[PDB]
Design an enzyme around this catalytic site. Structure first.
Site, PDB file in Angstrom:
ATOM      1  N   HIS A 117       1.908   1.408  -5.828  1.00  0.00           N
ATOM      2  CA  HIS A 117       0.537   1.073  -5.985  1.00  0.00           C
ATOM      3  C   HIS A 117      -0.880   2.161  -6.324  1.00  0.00           C
ATOM      4  CE1 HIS A 117      -3.483  -0.900  -5.052  1.00  0.00           C
ATOM      5  NE2 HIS A 117      -3.514  -0.256  -3.857  1.00  0.00           N
ATOM      6  N   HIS A 142       0.754  -1.064  -0.072  1.00  0.00           N
ATOM      7  CA  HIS A 142       0.065  -0.020   0.044  1.00  0.00           C
ATOM      8  C   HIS A 142       1.034   1.301   0.191  1.00  0.00           C
ATOM      9  CE1 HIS A 142      -3.028  -3.194   1.040  1.00  0.00           C
ATOM     10  NE2 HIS A 142      -3.738  -2.410   0.367  1.00  0.00           N
ATOM     11  N   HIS A 174      -5.912   7.226  -3.187  1.00  0.00           N
ATOM     12  CA  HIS A 174      -7.005   6.592  -2.560  1.00  0.00           C
ATOM     13  C   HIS A 174      -6.542   5.484  -1.235  1.00  0.00           C
ATOM     14  CE1 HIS A 174      -5.321   3.084  -4.807  1.00  0.00           C
ATOM     15  NE2 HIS A 174      -5.711   2.053  -3.849  1.00  0.00           N
ATOM     16  N   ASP A 175      -5.011   5.572  -1.336  1.00  0.00           N
ATOM     17  CA  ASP A 175      -4.376   4.846  -0.133  1.00  0.00           C
ATOM     18  C   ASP A 175      -3.516   5.607   0.695  1.00  0.00           C
ATOM     19  OD1 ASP A 175      -5.487   2.008   0.179  1.00  0.00           O
ATOM     20  OD2 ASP A 175      -4.136   1.606  -1.514  1.00  0.00           O
ATOM     21  N   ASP A 199      -8.039  -1.127  -8.153  1.00  0.00           N
ATOM     22  CA  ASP A 199      -7.404  -1.418  -6.892  1.00  0.00           C
ATOM     23  C   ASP A 199      -6.894  -2.863  -6.915  1.00  0.00           C
ATOM     24  OD1 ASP A 199      -6.574  -0.737  -4.325  1.00  0.00           O
ATOM     25  OD2 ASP A 199      -8.303  -0.549  -3.385  1.00  0.00           O
ATOM     26  N   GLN A 252      -5.691 -18.322  -3.213  1.00  0.00           N
ATOM     27  CA  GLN A 252      -5.566 -17.406  -4.452  1.00  0.00           C
ATOM     28  C   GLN A 252      -6.880 -17.795  -5.322  1.00  0.00           C
ATOM     29  OE1 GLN A 252      -3.686 -14.793  -5.814  1.00  0.00           O
ATOM     30  NE2 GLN A 252      -2.721 -14.593  -3.547  1.00  0.00           N
TER      31      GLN A 252
END
Ligand SMILES: c1ccc2nc(COc3ccc(-c4n[nH]cc4Cc4ccncc4)cc3)ccc2c1
Ligand SMILES: [Mg+2]
Ligand SMILES: [Zn+2]
Length: 305
Positions: free
Chosen positions: A67, A63, A101-102, A212, A264
């Site tokens: 990113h 993050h 956004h982060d 995202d 995953q």
């Protein structure tokens, strides 16, 4: 100015922004210039804003600033390939929302902050980190010389901040499940109306999820290496949970690392594939994300075999 290889490859949904941090700002400026105009923001103001955003991202494994720009790039590619749908103001807002956004993320989930009793969780009870990311965005805009939206009317200013606020909140994955369920029902009943503001907000929210999650739409080497960074944070949080006296979920427990491929599979089935499938139904030019997602699912299945 951008090298020729970047000028070409940046149009690919699966572009990776490279390891040269000092290029990332010019990559973002180029994207914003092409998605809005070179008379969209004052260049000097925009650069100052970008560098102050960079400075308020932390050196965490995933993050981080890389990113942020990667997510903005995905949004660039969606907007470039869906011309005529979104207004100038939406496109401006969405690229800035993605960049921001982060902001100030610590590498821990909302659930960890809640269990820890972090002060941010008393301030923002739901979507904790996301409310903070938006608060940080506004605080940066309020710095002297950082208002990239200063030529807008007050109404347009309030409008774009609300676009950004909704887009950042939507990156709380807990909200995606409900949003995507509503969008799928809308699709299949033929009731989706892009001229209806509430539907439009939902579609933008899905776009934010899709951007995202975009590591799962890259080529396999990128996807696999990115997953290492994601787990470095999750396992650190798992360690922290153990130190609070709380058994972490398997995803955050480094002792269950041999179960990564099964984990995953679960994510691709429950989250990623439904996300890009629904996105492709609403915006068919986003099909390459879905295709790359399916290819990566197949790679994880191959790891298990
Ligand atoms: C045991 C061991 C391993 C396990 N692994 C998983 C897989 O979890 C994943 C897979 C992909 C992603 C992802 N890749 N790119 C973006 C995201 C989303 C994301 C990233 C950061 N913070 C929040 C969300 C997130 C989680 C699930 C259960 C498991 C159990
Ligand atoms: Mg986030
Ligand atoms: Zn993010």
């Amino acid at each position: 100015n951008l090298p020729a290889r970047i000028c070409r490859d940046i149009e690919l949904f699966h572009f990776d922004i490279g390891p040269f941090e000092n290029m990332w700002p010019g990559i973002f400026v180029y994207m914003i210039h092409r998605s809005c105009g070179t008379s969209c923001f004052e260049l000097e103001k925009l650069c100052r804003f970008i560098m102050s955003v960079k400075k308020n991202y932390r050196r965490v494994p995933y993050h981080n600033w890389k990113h942020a720009v990667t997510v903005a790039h995905c949004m660039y590619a969606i907007l470039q390939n869906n011309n005529g749908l979104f207004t100038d103001l939406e496109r401006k807002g969405l690229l800035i929302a993605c960049l921001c956004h982060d902001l100030d993320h610590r590498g821990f989930s909302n659930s960890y902050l809640q269990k820890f009793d972090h002060p941010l969780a008393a301030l923002y009870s739901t979507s904790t980190m996301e409310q903070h990311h938006f608060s940080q965005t506004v605080s940066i805009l309020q710095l002297e010389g950082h208002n990239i939206f200063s030529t807008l009317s007050s109404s347009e200013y309030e409008q774009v901040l609300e676009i950004i606020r909704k887009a950042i909140i939507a990156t709380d994955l807990a909200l995606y499940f409900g949003n995507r369920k509503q969008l799928e029902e809308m699709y299949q009943t033929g009731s989706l109306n892009l001229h209806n503001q509430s539907h439009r907000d939902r579609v933008i929210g899905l776009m934010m999820t899709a951007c995202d999650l975009c590591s799962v739409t890259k080529l396999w080497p990128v996807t696999k290496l990115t997953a290492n960074d994601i787990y470095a944070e999750f396992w650190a949080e798992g360690d922290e949970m153990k130190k609070l006296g709380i058994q972490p979920i398997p995803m955050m427990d480094r002792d269950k690392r041999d179960e990564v491929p099964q984990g995953q599979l679960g994510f691709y089935n429950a989250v990623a594939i439904p996300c890009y499938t629904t996105l492709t139904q609403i915006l068919p030019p986003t099909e390459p994300l879905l295709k790359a997602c399916r290819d990566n699912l197949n790679q994880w299945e191959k790891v298990i075999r």
